Design a protein around this ligand. Sequence first.
Ligand SMILES: [Mg+2]
Length: 472
Amino acid sequence: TSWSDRLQNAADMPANMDKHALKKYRREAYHRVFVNRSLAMEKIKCFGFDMDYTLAVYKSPEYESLGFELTVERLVSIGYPQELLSFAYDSTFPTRGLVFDTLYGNLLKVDAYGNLLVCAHGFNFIRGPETREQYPNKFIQRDDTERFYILNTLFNLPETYLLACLVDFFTNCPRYTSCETGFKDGDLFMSYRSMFQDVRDAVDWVHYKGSLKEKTVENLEKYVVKDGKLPLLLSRMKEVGKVFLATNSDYKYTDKIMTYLFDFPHGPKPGSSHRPWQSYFDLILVDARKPLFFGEGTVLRQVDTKTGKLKIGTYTGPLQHGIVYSGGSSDTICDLLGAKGKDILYIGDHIFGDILKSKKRQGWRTFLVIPELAQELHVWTDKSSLFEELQSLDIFLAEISSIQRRIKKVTHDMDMCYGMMGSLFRSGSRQTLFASQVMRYADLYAASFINLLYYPFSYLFRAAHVLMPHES
Ligand SMILES: [Mg+2]
């Protein structure tokens, strides 16, 4: 059972809007909205959405496998060895948020400070003492964005696995010679960095020039999760405020995926006339180029909706019924909807491009969707027993040569229940970079934005007051 299976099984459920059915439902973790900083829902005036992996959650592992296979075929078609075609995506390896070090070819799981929690070279886990030969302080500067790349989105799951496949392949194929920074084949040297760049470019190419979009819209039932409760949530939001779409996808793909997600024999609820997806939004904006969107942005353009091409020129007019925007910036939303940052709850899945940058640069309220959270919650309960005993052992310390070894074996035991790269949020007792950025920049987070449906729209999401150590 994948994470997307749990969300499609939640998606098949119709809405029981009885207000205790909601209060009871919302208190099971899978359907709850979690709170890092307090949020008075009644002060929200604009609900904004990303599309891919927010409104449109792709089915796992079918979608990752498709992108992986298309990416590999792209690499082979530009000259990588034919043996890449024998690769097959394996969803139990990659965890989101890992760092690829283009210098030494390692995937790293790090904490908020760049401390190494996990180091894997290909498929072989480098344990502490050996990691020191390349990381003397067991630490990286995770800001050095020219050496390190953070595989931060669900679109990066295929290349996360692929990079480990490549490193393992070249390491063991006897026509290559391993060097510290890459692989030699006679007079040709392939560094890990150029290898990394080919994979990145292949993934881009598959997405923008290859057949990935086509194969997806050809079989949306196989690749995209559909939920009849989405029209209902958006229509409730449209009563209490304004709803808008700001997505990086182009209009044609947006229209194809949005149309699918509203393809029901009803509208907001069973019995009601179906409505076009566009009618659910006071403002629709494609080609957003987030996170640039939250700084200077780009020129505001108008989509020719009959053709899917942009109209020539910059759009200077007012917000108009039926108009579809391309580009612009966060201030475009604020101007045309007459909103300020904290009137805006932006709902998305990219911790950098949607959440961090809108919080830091514009002061927007944030809702982060974590699709894996459905599964992560299932694992964290089922095996929390060994975490409390892990946690009890860190103070079992207090004032004993085996104690520092039972902690290491418990931590590894906890990690493997999630996959080979461990939990999205933890390695044992230590929070990941990702976990830290969620807490710091996501005002709210949930396995799915649909969990909002189970809360009244006056609700005050409250988090505990934070206290410094000396304040206790
Ligand atoms: Mg997204």
